[PDB]
Amino acid sequence: VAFGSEDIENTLAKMDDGQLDGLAFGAIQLDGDGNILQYNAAEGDITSRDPKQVIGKNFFKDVAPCTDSPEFYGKFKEGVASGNLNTMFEYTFDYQMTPTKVKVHMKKALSGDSYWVFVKRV
Numbered sequence: 001v002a003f004g005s006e007d008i009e010n011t012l013a014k015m016d017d018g019q020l021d022g023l024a025f026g027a028i029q030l031d032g033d034g035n036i037l038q039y040n041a042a043e044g045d046i047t048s049r050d051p052k053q054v055i056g057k058n059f060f061k062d063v064a065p066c067t068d069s070p071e072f073y074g075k076f077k078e079g080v081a082s083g084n085l086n087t088m089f090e091y092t093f094d095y096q097m098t099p100t101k102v103k104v105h106m107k108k109a110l111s112g113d114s115y116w117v118f119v120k121r122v
């Protein structure tokens with residue numbers, strides 16, 4: 001189970017409350033509109049966020065506005081509208097933080113009503 005694993009959505013679907021926090025890569029679960037449902041420890045470290053605080057906020061509007069663009073937020077809504085989200089790219093996170101380069105992997109969750117955003121430094 002690692003960043004980029006071909007069946008990552010299967011393994012996470014079988015996880016609990018804090019198992020998500022044992023992952024070496026940042027992991028965020030969003031609903032179809034971009035609202036944060038889950039946000040693990042690793043992501044909070046990478047972006048200097050307190051996980052408990054970002055839950056409930058909209059990822060694209062409030063927490064990660066730099067991701068509100070055709071290549072990130074744009075691809076997110078396409079995958080949502082096709083039931084097949086599974087894309088990788090590099091990006092730079094800079095809102096309320098020191099600009100940090102990262103590799104991003106977005107992928108639909110098994111339920112097909114929620115979506116994952118995986119992150120690791122590069």
Ligand SMILES: *C(=O)/C=C/c1ccc(O)cc1
Nearest residue numbers: 047064065066093094095
């Ligand atoms: C761009 O503004 C990105 C900001 C951001 C990305 C990921 C996070 O977990 C927190 C903030």
